[PDB]
């Protein structure tokens, strides 16, 4: 039968009030014969009725995929309220209920360390700028790169990795042309986490 997966909001969306966080209830392996799917959302117990259901997206394995989105309040998610999604389809032995919430555990502030490129890498034409973020909890975090107000987009960030002391860490790699780095340009690693003041901090990296 159809499976159900429940996803949390994006970390940036819960930390920034100008953004809209939302929990996502994905239903996969929905048969062609029984496509209709009903959604029941429950916040901490009480039922809400403000969630929207996106149209079915036919997949490349002879099944449909239904998605329901429930916008959440920033405080409710961060304070640990529980979101429940009940999926009822005319082909399940019983409606499936899934539940997610914040991780529970004392939050810990992320330490941010910018790392210059290795001298051995200056042979190449592009150079790797590194941002180490370690010691934070929970794993919900957002990392970005900018250079004097302008977003640097050619970057990749590893997923959060559980560390030996219970906290999390990750690395973010920004790739810039070596000439920009040798020219003394200033790059910035913007990190967003609930344990930071104003949910924000940033560190700069520059040749000297």
């Amino acid at each position, epitope marked *: 039968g159809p499976s159900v997966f429940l996803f949390p909001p994006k970390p940036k969306d819960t*930390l*920034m*009030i*100008s*953004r809209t966080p939302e929990v996502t209830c994905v239903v996969v392996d929905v048969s062609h014969e029984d496509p209709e799917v009903k959604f029941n959302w429950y916040v901490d117990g009480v039922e809400v009725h403000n969630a929207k259901t996106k149209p079915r997206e036919e997949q490349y394995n002879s099944t449909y995929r239904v998605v329901s989105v429930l916008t959440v309040l920033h405080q409710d998610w961060l304070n640990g309220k529980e979101y429940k999604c009940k999926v009822s389809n005319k082909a399940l032995p019983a409606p499936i209920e899934k539940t997610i919430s914040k991780a529970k555990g004392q939050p810990r502030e992320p330490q941010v360390y910018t790392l210059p490129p290795s001298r051995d890498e200056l042979t190449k034409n592009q150079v790797s700028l590194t941002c180490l973020v370690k010691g934070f909890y929970p794993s919900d975090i957002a990392v970005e790169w900018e*250079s004097n*107000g302008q977003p640097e987009n050619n970057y990749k960030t590893t997923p959060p990795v559980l560390d030996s002391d219970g906290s999390f860490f990750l690395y973010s790699k920004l790739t810039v042309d070596k000439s920009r780095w040798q020219q*003394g340009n200033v790059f910035s690693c913007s990190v967003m986490h609930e344990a930071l003041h104003n949910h*924000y901090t940033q560190k700069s990296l520059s040749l000297s």
Partner: antibody
Amino acid sequence: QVQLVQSGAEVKKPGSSVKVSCKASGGTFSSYPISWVRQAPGQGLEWVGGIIPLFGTANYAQRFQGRVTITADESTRTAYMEVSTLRSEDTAVYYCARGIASAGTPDYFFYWGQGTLVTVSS
Amino acid sequence: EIVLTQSPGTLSLSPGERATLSCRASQSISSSYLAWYQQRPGQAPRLLIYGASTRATGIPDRFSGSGSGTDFTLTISRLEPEDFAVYYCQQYGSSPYTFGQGTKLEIKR
């Protein structure tokens, strides 16, 4: 505009505690982070801490951690800074400040209270 | 933490002359989060400039800011009498937020 009005001058003995209030009137309260900045007589400005009233999670400069508690009451639109175990080196003016952009975006200090002189005198 | 160093300590100029105030950062910082404030005696700081160069609303055009990296400057093209106070630079890109020592402008007579 927003109006930040703090409580009056305080005189305390060492070791005692003080709690300065900062009522915000005019604009929306919960979404904007309120910070506390202090200034010793004749000296410069030092950021003590801050809080976003909507989330209730304060943050502090390392030198004040374990000594300052910052809170925010949404029902009365009032931010508080409480400093326990007062030292004479805490004698300073304390300002509350915000804050044009909502929480999550880096911002400057645009609105300021009138200041609260805290004297630690025997 | 980031240390802002302001120069000079006191600046003695006459009304009508040009003023330059420097703010050296201990390390490179994004210019998008450098602010300048003015403070008169017995008053709270007033925001002059943010983003290193953008002028706050309702600030006379004689105040301008510039710089990047570790070197930022606040220039008053033509000093008015109410421009003689103390000026602070402040970064707000990373906690803790930090201020320079301040520079005092006094009237040269």
